C-alpha cells in the first residue's frame, strides 16, 4: 500500500514529560510510529531530530514532528499545560481535544498533567468519548513510589509488593493498607506513605522537577493499551457509583486492555471508606463545580 | 555473601547526557548498578529518586547516587564539564580521574564530553591505564547521523546501510565515501554529509542542547563492552602509527568488547588520506601541545 | 469491542519447525495472537498448553489452537509437509493454501518447508496472491551459516560481517564473494562455504533434524514484516527479470517490509552471474516443469 | 586479558528440556556464555551447531558443546536422567555431581529432573554445598499453571493473580487457598486445581512430552539468580524447620538472588496445613530413607 502504521502515538507537549515519555517508549521497542506536537513547533523539530540521529542504536520505530496526525493514531497522550491552574489549563486543553478531534479521532486519550484526575474529566467532558477511551495518569506513579520503598523496607523487589495508593493524584490520596500484601503474606510504614505523598515535593526541590518517573509510569499503561494486557493498574477512572461516587475522575484500580478502561474494580475498603476516598472524592468533586467556566 | 554487583557504571556528570544515558541503560536492561556522581550533589540524590520510583515498570537494575563506588566499578562514563574549553576541562578531567584512580579502578572509562577526542587522550594521560582501556564517545553518534540520513534516502533502515565517519567529533571529521555499502552494493550525498556535519549546531538552535542522540550512542559502546560483543564501533581510540599517526585519539573504526579495545581497523582510504584524515589527525595533534598546562 | 488482534500469526504445522517458532516468537514478545493449526490436532492442543503455562514467564502474547483463524490473520507461516518430495508436497500444500483462502485471506504466506524456493512458487500459483504477499524461507539460514563462520574466523560479531548466500535453498546455492565485506572492508574460505552448504546433512547426521537454526531465522522476515521494517534480507523472492531470470522464486536479497516484499535487490555479480545463479535458476526453472501435476 | 565470561550457564542434559531452556535463554538475551554437556556428545554438538547458526538473529550470547567447563561456572543445571527412578536416577546423579565438582565448582545448581523434590535432596548431598546454593525446580511451572488458568477465569493478566502451589512437586502438592488474591482482592476452582495437578498427565499424553512450559520457569529462576532480582518464586526450598519440618527439600515460596536462596518465607497457612504440607513433606521424608543406596 503505501507506508502503513498500526501502533501510532502522538505525545502534545514534547517538554520533559513528553520528552521522556517518547525516549522511554523508544528505547523500549514499544510502538511504531511516535508523533510529537507542541505549540512550540521548534522544540518538538529539534527533539525529533535528536530522537532520530541514535534510532539506529534502539530496537526500530519511526519519528515525525499539526493534529491532522491524530488520523489513526492509536492513542494520544496529553502532556502539556501550565505552571487558577485548573482554569487556565481546562483552557489550553479546551483547544487540544477540540482540534484532535476535528481530524475524527477514534483512539484513546492518556493525560499525564496535573491537576490531573481533574484535567482527565475535562478531557472527557470536551472530546464526546465514552469514559472508557479517556484515561488519566493517576496514583499509577503514586503505587510504584509506594510498591519502592516498601520492597525496600522488605529488601524484596517491589514488583512482589502488591500495595495500592487510591484517591486523588495529590494531598488526598490514601493508601490501601489493609489489602496490601508481600507475594500473598499481608503486613515505621506510616512514614514510608508520608514519604510516598510528599515525593514530587522532595525530588523538585532538589532538581527542580519531576518527568523520569511518570514517563515510566506512562510507558506501561501504554503498554497495557498497545498490548492488550488485561492489566490491573490504578489509574484515573471514572466513577460509576462504585466506590459510592456518582461523577468524578479519581485513582482507582482499573482493568486496562486495547480498547480502553474494561473494569474499575472496587476493592473492599477499611472504615478507609466514605472518609479517606469519600473525603477524597468530595474535594475533586467540587473543583469540577468551582472550576470550568473559560 | 553481601549483596553483589557484577556490572557496574558509575556516571560522572548527572546532567543531560549523564541523566539520559542512565535512563537509557535502565530502560534497556543493560546494566545491574548504575551509580550517579555530580559536584552538585543535590541533582544526582533528585535524579537518583525520580530513576528509583518508576524503576518497578522497567526490566531490573538498582540505583544509588563519592568516587569510593570506583571500586570494583566495571565502566566509569565521563559526562562532566564546562561550556579555554579544553583547558577548563583537561583543570575539571584532571581531578574527576585522579580520584577515580584513587580508589584503585581497574575498570574502563568512556569519556563523552566535548572536546572529547581531546578529553579523551587526557583521560588516559591522567589515570595510567592501557590507551585500551580509555575510550572515547568519539564519531560514533557522526555515524549513526549518516547511517540514518541515507537510510532515509534509499528509504532502507539505517542497519543495513555501512557508512562511517571518521576524524575529529567535530568539523574535521571527513565521511568514507569510497567504502560505504548498503547491504554489500557500494553506492545530492555531499549534502546529506553537510547536514551530517552541522547537525549539533542545527539541534542546538531549536532546542537549546544536545543529549539523546549521544547518550543512545553512549548504551551502544556500553552494551559492546559488558556482553564481550567484539562490535565494530567507530569510537575515539589511540593511533598507533595506524592510519599514519603516532600519538593521537582520534574517530576510528575499533573492535569493542569487555576488556576495552581489542585493534583499531585500517579501512583502506582514498586518497582521503594523509588530507582529510591527516588535517584532522593533525588539527588534534597540536591542541594537545597548545593545551594541557593548567 | 470484543477481544481484539492486529498482529496475528498462524503457524500451519506445529512440529520442530513450527513448534520452535513459536517458542521463538513467544519468548522475543514478536506477536499479538499466535494460532496453531496440524492435521494433528492432538499434538497443536498439546502444544498450545504447554506454551500457555509458562506464558507467564514470558512478556506476553496470547496462544490458541481451523482455517477459520485466517481471518484478519496477518501472516501464515506454512511450516507442513512430507519427507516425489516436490509433488507430494505440492500435493499436501495444494490443500493448505486452497483452506486458508477460503476464509478469504488478505495476508502474507511465510514458507518454511523445503524444497522451499519450489514450494514458494506453488503457494504463489494455488492462493491469487501477487507475489510480493508470497514469502520463502529462502537463503537465510544459509547467509546466518556464513556470516556466523566468517565472524568467527574474523573473531568479529556475525553481525558485522556482510555476506550473503544467493541461488537455491540447496546444492545450487553459490555465494557472492566478490561483494562481501567485514564492516566495510571487503576480504581457507572457499572450505567454510563447503561447510555453509554440508550444514544440514553435517547436524541431521548427528541429531536427527535441523530446527532451531531456521525458526531463529523465520522469526526475524515476521520481525521484518510486523514492524515495517525495510530490512534487506536474503529469502525466495520471484524474479521479474532481474538477475536475467523471468518466471522462478529463488534466494535473493529483497527488502521487507508491512507490505510483503518492497524489491528486488540486483547485487552486482563477477561472472560468478549466468553461471553459478543461472545454473541455479535453471535448476529450479525446471523442477517447475518436470513436477507439479497431482 | 583472554576472552572472558562473567555470567556462564552450563546445562547437563541437552534433550528436551535443556535444548528448550537453552533456546528460551538464547531468545531472551539472558546468559553470556552457555556451555551444553550430555553423555551422548553427538546431540550436544548437534545442537550447538543449530543454535550457532541463527544466532546472527538474536540480542548475542556464547554457545559452545566436558566438565572442565565448570570452572567460573555460574549456574549448573541439571536437566539429566531416567524414565526404580528415584534410586536409578540418584544413580546418574551420584555421578554428574561428583564431576562438576572435580573442577572444584563454586556455583549454584539447578534441578529441573523429576523426581526433582527428591533429586534436589540428592544433589546437596552429593556436593557439599551450602543448601542455598542447591536449588530445585520446584512447584514453579504448578503455580504459573495455577496463574494461568485463574488469569483466564477472571480473564486478568496471569501477572496480577497471585497464588501459589506448594508441597512436592507431583501428586501431594496443595494450592494455598486462603492467601490467593487477584490483585488485592482475594477470592469451580476445586476444578482448576485438579486441571493444575494433572496437567503433565494431560499434555503428555497428546503430545508425549512436557518441555517448553518448564524451561519458561527454569529461564525465570535463572534471571532471579543472574540478576540478583530478590525475587519470591515457589521453588524447592530446604526446610529448617520452617513450615513444621525438618531434613526434606518441598516446594515454598523462597526469595531468590545471584547467591541461591535467602530466605524461606513462611505464608500463614489455613488448616492446610500438618495437613496437605505435612502429608507432603512426609510423603518426601520417606522416599529419601526407602531410596538412596546404590
Same mark, same amino acid.
Given at each position: 500500500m503505501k507506508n502503513n502504521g498500526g501502533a501510532r502515538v502522538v505525545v502534545i507537549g514534547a517538554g520533559f514529560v513528553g520528552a521522556s515519555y517518547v525516549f522511554a517508549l523508544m528505547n523500549q521497542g514499544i510502538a511504531d510510529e511516535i508523533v510529537l506536537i507542541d505549540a512550540n513547533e521548534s522544540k518538538a523539530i529539534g527533539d525529533a531530530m535528536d530522537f532520530n $540521529? @541514535?534510532?539506529?542504536? &534502539?530496537?526500530k520505530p519511526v519519528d515525525i514532528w499539526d493534529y491532522d496526525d491524530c488520523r489513526d493514531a492509536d492513542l494520544v497522550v496529553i502532556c502539556a499545560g501550565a505552571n487558577d491552574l485548573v482554569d487556565k489549563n481546562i483552557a489550553i486543553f479546551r483547544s487540544i481535544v477540540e482540534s484532535v478531534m476535528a481530524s475524527g479521532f477514534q483512539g484513546l486519550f492518556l493525560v499525564a498533567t496535573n491537576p490531573v484526575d481533574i484535567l482527565t474529566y475535562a478531557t472527557w467532558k470536551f472530546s464526546g468519548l465514552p469514559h472508557e477511551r479517556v484515561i488519566g495518569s493517576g496514583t499509577i506513579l503514586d503505587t510504584a513510589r509506594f510498591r519502592f520503598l516498601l520492597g525496600e523496607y522488605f529488601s524484596v523487589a517491589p514488583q512482589n509488593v502488591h500495595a495500592y495508593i487510591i484517591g486523588e $493524584? #495529590? %494531598?488526598?490520596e490514601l493508601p490501601v493498607?489493609?489489602? &496490601? !500484601?508481600?507475594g500473598v503474606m499481608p503486613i515505621d510504614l506510616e512514614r514510608i506513605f508520608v514519604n510516598v505523598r510528599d515525593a514530587a515535593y522532595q525530588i523538585i526541590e532538589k532538581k527542580g522537577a519531576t518527568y523520569y518517573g511518570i514517563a515510566m509510569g506512562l510507558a506501561r499503561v501504554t503498554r497495557a493499551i498497545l498490548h492488550n494486557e488485561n492489566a490491573i493498574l490504578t489509574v484515573s477512572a471514572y466513577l460509576d #457509583?462504585? !466506590? @459510592?461516587?456518582? %461523577?468524578v475522575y479519581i485513582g482507582v484500580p482499573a482493568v486496562i486492555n486495547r480498547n480502553g478502561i474494561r473494569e474499575v474494580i472496587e476493592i473492599e475498603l477499611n472504615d478507609d471508606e466514605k472518609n479517606r476516598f469519600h473525603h477524597s472524592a468530595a474535594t475533586l468533586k467540587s473543583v469540577l463545580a468551582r472550576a470550568f467556566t473559560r
Amino acid at each position: 500500500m503505501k507506508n502503513n502504521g498500526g501502533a501510532r502515538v502522538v505525545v502534545i507537549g514534547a517538554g520533559f514529560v513528553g520528552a521522556s515519555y517518547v525516549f522511554a517508549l523508544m528505547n523500549q521497542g514499544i510502538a511504531d510510529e511516535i508523533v510529537l506536537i507542541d505549540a512550540n513547533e521548534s522544540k518538538a523539530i529539534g527533539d525529533a531530530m535528536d530522537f532520530n $540521529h @541514535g534510532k539506529v542504536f &534502539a530496537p526500530k520505530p519511526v519519528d515525525i514532528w499539526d493534529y491532522d496526525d491524530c488520523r489513526d493514531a492509536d492513542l494520544v497522550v496529553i502532556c502539556a499545560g501550565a505552571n487558577d491552574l485548573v482554569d487556565k489549563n481546562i483552557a489550553i486543553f479546551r483547544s487540544i481535544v477540540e482540534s484532535v478531534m476535528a481530524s475524527g479521532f477514534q483512539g484513546l486519550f492518556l493525560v499525564a498533567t496535573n491537576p490531573v484526575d481533574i484535567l482527565t474529566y475535562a478531557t472527557w467532558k470536551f472530546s464526546g468519548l465514552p469514559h472508557e477511551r479517556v484515561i488519566g495518569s493517576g496514583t499509577i506513579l503514586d503505587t510504584a513510589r509506594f510498591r519502592f520503598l516498601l520492597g525496600e523496607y522488605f529488601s524484596v523487589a517491589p514488583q512482589n509488593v502488591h500495595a495500592y495508593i487510591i484517591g486523588e $493524584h #495529590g %494531598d488526598t490520596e490514601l493508601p490501601v493498607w489493609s489489602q &496490601a !500484601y508481600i507475594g500473598v503474606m499481608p503486613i515505621d510504614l506510616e512514614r514510608i506513605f508520608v514519604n510516598v505523598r510528599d515525593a514530587a515535593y522532595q525530588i523538585i526541590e532538589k532538581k527542580g522537577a519531576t518527568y523520569y518517573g511518570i514517563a515510566m509510569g506512562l510507558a506501561r499503561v501504554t503498554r497495557a493499551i498497545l498490548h492488550n494486557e488485561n492489566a490491573i493498574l490504578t489509574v484515573s477512572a471514572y466513577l460509576d #457509583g462504585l !466506590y @459510592g461516587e456518582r %461523577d468524578v475522575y479519581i485513582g482507582v484500580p482499573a482493568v486496562i486492555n486495547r480498547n480502553g478502561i474494561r473494569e474499575v474494580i472496587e476493592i473492599e475498603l477499611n472504615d478507609d471508606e466514605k472518609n479517606r476516598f469519600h473525603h477524597s472524592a468530595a474535594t475533586l468533586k467540587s473543583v469540577l463545580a468551582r472550576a470550568f467556566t473559560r
